[PDB]
Design a protein around this ligand. Structure first.
Ligand SMILES: N[C@@H](Cc1ccccc1)C(=O)O
Ligand SMILES: N[C@@H](Cc1ccccc1)C(=O)O
Ligand SMILES: N[C@@H](Cc1ccccc1)C(=O)O
Ligand SMILES: N[C@@H](Cc1ccccc1)C(=O)O
Ligand SMILES: [Cl-]
Ligand SMILES: [Cl-]
Ligand SMILES: [Cl-]
Ligand SMILES: [Mn+2]
Ligand SMILES: [Mn+2]
Ligand SMILES: [Mn+2]
Ligand SMILES: [Mn+2]
Lengths: 346, 346, 346, 344
């Protein structure tokens, strides 16, 4: 026999099943209530029943749980303070997806050394998400595959599908069965249609392969997800301004799906310059003051210390994309709370 | 206590593991040889060492294995006849990735009635692939997810990643560990960069989540795939002619990857008219007659009976994309063999 | 760091789960009916509601399925002929327990070569058992561990726990959850108390570890088995005669369990001499003629060809304990039918 | 379809696999060394290369981990004290194979809830803590699955009187990482235990699960470190005559003629106050000759006696045990007698 199986595989290793983590870290009654309620409050925004602004805000990536928890303490106070204008949810992303050289994130490589201790990574991820919900901070994350959600999606109040997978049929099928509302990014070249098609698709029932809670190969049958929306993240040019929002809203209505959308203040819309997220937020603030009816949320990349570093030396500073520091965070949130108070008052 | 888990899920159902199908339908010695040899022969085309034309030809999708086996019997004779000019490999795709409330393909719905019998579907897929190889017909397929490959990739001589997944980080990681050579399609809008980036990415080691042969949740560590190439499948306009082949070949060389490519005569290159595949094949033949040095392969949607039908009433006729029939298939293969015979003689 | 795990282990290999075999060889409607009815009819004998004689008869061990099935075809005629007097069930034991450098049975070694193809062995066992029930011949077997029953117990009408395991707590727990009636043998030196205690224990609920049908480590909670009885198989001294039956029945009643018992004509009661089976059976027929009210069944080791051999040269001749041949089998069965007819008519 | 599957089954429930417990409670470097070394030391006693007396001593069954650890803290001091004469290993048995409490793995809350995931975790956690403080552990393996959860923490294993003759339990012993003692039968029968040594030295196949919890076939290498345990039967078998008898038969079978004597169970006629009498007899044999004795078993707890409910702390709820004071005396007694033997 010539070999034909696993020719280009170095190793296949068993992971602990979801249920091993769920046994160690069950969702508490209070975390359950927060997640349940936060998903519902987000649905209300997606569907225009409430005019608060959803704000997904936090580090580009989580590389330190201690810092993430300190960040969440500071954020919670503003969450509460602005609760009538803003719905603040912490950004809890474990990786920056690069199909290239670079750290593969906290789940895949928690030790930051290339050892791929994924059992530890998943444990740490779940543990942080549970501690967050327990202190009263809801969590948001991006789902990159069809298996990881079984480990922690019970703790997630809002989920993202990235620009590179929005068109993927199987990722649309995943979104159709996510317990949380889901945002779809427009394409890497600014293509809106793939995200608009994604919202329609994810509303329907699908089948996809995954694993049971007990860790075994499975077929999953979804019910559909009515709570999906687009996320404007730039493309050929930035797409956050009134003209781009109006055009997207127009296309959304034509497709018969929600014309309420979210705008990334970071990444391509800021020209990959953290000091310009404020610029985008100010533009958004002005929209909310003039009208801004089609805006239901924004995303901001924020951390305890501004900027970036390429190794984790400075506490609370990003090792992936540069973030605004805490001072600028307070200023940006005050700005959007002020502006949206006026919108809501009409 | 509020519910937070599987809110939008109808059912999660354990499947028989890969080892069960592997036990019932082990790869034979002769099939092992055919797969091993065909992968190497395809590698030689991808890297420019052989000038035969890879021809990926057959149904848009397999909805009846009995008709697929008859097709293969006819195709085998031409595989043999043209073996000095063409390397013929049968198209064995189990579903057409569709955003439409329609048939989910042989794996998900093998009884064609909406019952979703996946154990039976995976068993049917493997059984067909084993019979194909045992008769002397190598098989090709598109891998839509990270789990199905564990059930039958050992029988696959060439694999596709489609236009909607070529940009996906996780599908690129899958390709980096597939035992077969892999073609990446250009984007649905015509974008070639996603496929060029995919070749580079898939050449390196990645990690991704999947299941073991025993069916347990697993982390997969790949070795990288040196046998990847692009597929021109059209965009806003078709991209099969000499000026598009030349532009694509410039871009491949500038990226430092193989500038040998495959052209799809169907889908957006035929603008969804099966009668135009022959016109595309004639343009390709003319290119091979004049020069055609960057062309290593073509794809063709072909069945026993031409056209398409919504229900599987006529035997050997597609229920997904419309295909050329057997007579036109003989003419098309005769044409490419004759033109490539000349290319090879220079 | 010193090693402590699996020091004396050569290999741990994954087995196909029970569900894989059940998938390929589901129990039929007719087999289901036969197994259900036969378990019922045997229960009737155990509890004195019917006075037919259970006869567990066939090869000491199955080493060839073709010959087992031919034996079954012959035995089936006699099962039908004598159905008003005898309840004939085929002996379908897969290994003989032996601490002596011996073939380890059809499940461990189905190729009869010292290879250990247990997937194939379990498949062969389930396949033979399904074929036997489908032809109208119910089947009996000995269960030696807590896992193998998951593969084929659904096809078993009567089960034994052997002399060497009757006192084992975990084997009694197994018997308490077996779907069939269970016979417990008296101990290897003739101890009866262990089998009497076993019946009492097995009537209660127990917990024991096993695997799920899907093949995963499991805790099993049993309901208790009310259809256990003892089997007299000899020891230091044979125990088949009237005086041994009467002392056994007295002890059974003193423990408040069924005083209906089975007598093995083979093994220690024949002194390993296959020609003594008929003399033991003649003694039992005499008991049935005079009274024999405590006898509900017998065991006989029988094959197409009498004797034994060390290698499987001759067709339908035992490679474990020596058996009686077919002609003697016909004689023995006509004997018991005639004698039990007189017992039943009283 | 008439039903034929699981007719007499209330439920079948998947368990957390061994890997889940291993992840939470990996064996430490220190525990690994202790286990590895203690198994070697025991092998040395089984084959007569060292003349220290193995002492398997502790509760009949473990129903409380708190009490077990306190017991182990006291026993450790005597383990060290008598280390040149005795090789002390703690008895850590989770069940008495009987109606009643099904033991610490099956019913860890002692209330009939049958929380087996909790049970196996508790068992493992207790075994790791013991080894981490320096007290090696022994246990009886009753089935073929439990060893995947904690056998890596076990320095000596038993197969009891009711399972010694079992083909499958012999097969298990043939793959156990620890030395294994086989008890004589409940009626006194020594032959089943002698045969078990021979069988267990050979390779076997038996069914079990992988560390990941999947149905598996286990191919063993054989266990060369098996021996018999004398535990009584019709009559107690601990005295000098019974020992010589047994030693001969071990020789006639070509297996190690060094053996263990249980001072409890049928040898004390189920009377915990007679264990000391049996130990005094063994002490006399050691003082005179006793060349064939490599070990003894003793059922000991913080507090003497037994009780039907777990009311008093450190008092057995299964077989009755000697208390701590008697344990001090008994160990002093055996150390002193074996010191003399080792001196000759
Ligand atoms: N458990 C996920 C859905 C899911 C099920 C199965 C596989 C993958 C995802 C949720 O609650 O959102
Ligand atoms: N078995 C696949 C590789 C693979 C392994 C694991 C998961 C997915 C894919 C092949 O031979 O191509
Ligand atoms: N399935 C067996 C009972 C059983 C269940 C689980 C483990 C072992 C045995 C029967 O029907 O008799
Ligand atoms: N893990 C056991 C051996 C074993 C393996 C598999 C099943 C049962 C037992 C040990 O180290 O002793
Ligand atoms: Cl993205
Ligand atoms: Cl983002
Ligand atoms: Cl396409
Ligand atoms: Mn970022
Ligand atoms: Mn198609
Ligand atoms: Mn026999
Ligand atoms: Mn005891």
């Amino acid at each position: 026999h010539y070999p034909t199986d696993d020719i280009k595989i170095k190793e296949v290793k068993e992971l602990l099943p979801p249920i091993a983590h769920l046994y160690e870290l069950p969702i508490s009654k209070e975390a359950s209530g927060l997640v349940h309620r936060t998903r519902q409050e987000i649905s209300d925004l997606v569907h225009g029943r409430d005019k608060r602004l959803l704000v997904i805000i936090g580090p580009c990536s989580i590389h330190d749980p201690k810092a993430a928890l300190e960040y969440a303490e500071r954020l919670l106070k503003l969450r509460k303070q602005y609760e009538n204008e803003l719905l603040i949810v912490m950004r809890v992303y474990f990786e920056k997806p690069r199909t290239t050289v670079g750290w593969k994130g906290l789940i895949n490589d928690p030790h930051l050394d290339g050892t791929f201790d994924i059992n530890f990574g998943l444990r740490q991820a779940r543990s942080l998400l549970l501690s967050l919900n327990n202190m009263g901070m809801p969590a948001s994350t991006e789902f990159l595959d069809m298996i990881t959600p079984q480990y922690y999606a019970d703790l997630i109040s809002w989920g993202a599908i990235g620009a590179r997978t929005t068109e993927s049929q199987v990722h649309r099928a995943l979104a159709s069965g996510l317990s949380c509302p889901v945002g779809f990014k427009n394409g890497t070249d600014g293509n809106l249609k793939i995200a608009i098609d994604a919202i329609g698709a994810a509303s329907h029932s699908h089948h996809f392969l995954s694993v049971t809670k007990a860790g075994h190969s499975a077929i999953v049958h979804t019910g559909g997800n009515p709570d999906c929306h687009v996320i404007l993240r730039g493309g050929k040019e930035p797409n956050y301004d009134a003209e781009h929002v109006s055009e997207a809203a127009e296309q959304l209505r034509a497709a018969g799906v929600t014309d309420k959308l979210m705008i990334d203040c970071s990444h391509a819309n800021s020209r990959k310059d953290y000091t310009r997220q404020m610029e985008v937020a100010q533009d958004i603030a002005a929209q909310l003051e003039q009208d801004g009816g089609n805006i239901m949320g924004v995303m901001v990349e924020s951390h305890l210390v501004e900027g970036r570093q390429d190794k984790p030396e400075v506490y609370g500073k990003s090792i992936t994309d540069a973030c605004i520091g805490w001072g600028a965070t307070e200023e940006l949130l005050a700005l959007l709370a002020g502006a949206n108070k006026k919108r809501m008052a009409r």
